[PDB]
Symmetry: C2
Subunit: 131 residues, 2 copies
């Protein structure tokens, strides 16, 4: 069971609950999605998207990943509100171009080789998605 | 530095670093030259691969073969050594006939636990056979 876009794939990680692997069509890992909060009564899903540090721009790919996964959450899972936590290093352009709101900045939630880094909090609701 | 599926590009503005990407432009990892000695015709490098969710053996073998051709045929190197994190599958190195020359114990600290690195080697005679 997976999700397919033109250049990307999203698949559940075999051993692990709430973890999904993002790859390209040769099966090289782009990153991973981790479900952080899911509540069916609130129709609410919040996840963390890790993207490997890229040597080049992959904004078209990020846009696809987000588009693929949102379609899944909103249209195949009854979600009303989706939030996405991402390291501030990830390119914020794809999010803004797809219509996500910046809902906050989670300061100093990442420690990476001994420096604390910030995360962005993005949000989108069904109304937003479906307009 | 081009194969079928992969490419290796010298990084601008840095010394001794190469970006490994696939044809789709997605980053596989990077090569860092650690020791180069033209009088010993010796080149040792570290190759970092992002943790892969699927086996990418075929792609890693291409990357290794492309880079070996570059060192042996266009940089007059006689001996190459490659340093890799233990979490890198050894399958590409063995399948290409690299010698397993050592294990560098506890040379990596990642999220606060010690990991080893493997040391692989190939000389020209091995490459050319």
């Amino acid at each position: 069971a997976m999700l397919k876009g033109k250049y990307t794939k999203i698949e559940k990680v075999n051993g692990v609950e709430r973890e999904y692997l993002i790859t390209d069509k040769y099966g090289i890992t782009i990153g991973r999605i981790f479900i952080v909060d899911l509540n069916k009564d609130n129709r609410f899903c919040m996840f963390r998207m890790k993207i490997y540090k890229q040597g080049k721009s992959i904004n078209t790919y990020i846009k696809e990943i987000l588009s693929v996964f949102m379609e899944f959450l909103f249209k195949s899972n009854d979600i009303n509100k989706v939030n996405i936590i991402v390291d501030e290093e990830v390119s914020t352009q794809p999010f803004v171009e797809l219509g996500f709101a910046f809902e906050g900045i989670i300061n100093k939630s990442i420690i990476e080789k001994n420096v604390l880094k910030d995360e962005f909090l993005f949000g989108m609701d069904y109304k937003n998605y479906n307009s």
